[PDB]
Amino acid sequence: SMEQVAMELRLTELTRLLRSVLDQLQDKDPARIFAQPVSLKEVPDYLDHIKHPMDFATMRKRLEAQGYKNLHEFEEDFDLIIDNCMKYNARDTVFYRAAVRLRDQGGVVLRQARREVDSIG
């Protein structure tokens, strides 16, 4: 149908905007602490601690499958990255500190993306 096409073009355009958002958020992690999943070879007990792991590579796979239907879903996954880290790692660690800086800096980027999504429909 013409409606299913128009909806697909809306999803494609959301995917384009989310791809730019993801690139901007990932620049706020220059150390690449959040780039890939926590290794279960190197942290074999991780899943006993963290029930829903997340990382930027896993978000990028979901994105390119047009697996995010709205910004809320995408923010959910970003928030898991931060929140998982802040639970697993102690406050006095490079990991925790990197998450706090990512959260703080990403907030700005996400604030305007929410406006661009509401604005462009």
To one decimal place, what's the resolution in Å?
1.6
Instruction: Give the chain as a DSSP string.
Output: -HHHHHHHHHHHHHHHHHHHHHHHHHHT-TT-TTSSPPPTTTSTTHHHH-SS---HHHHHHHHHTT---SHHHHHHHHHHHHHHHHHHS-TTSHHHHHHHHHHHHHHHHHHHHHHHHHH--
On the 0-12 / 13-18 / 19+ scale of CB atoms within 10 A, 19 is: middle
Tokens of residue 77, six digits: 């996954």
> Which class does domain 1-121 fall in?
mainly alpha
On the 0-12 / 13-18 / 19+ scale of CB atoms within 10 A, 81 is: buried
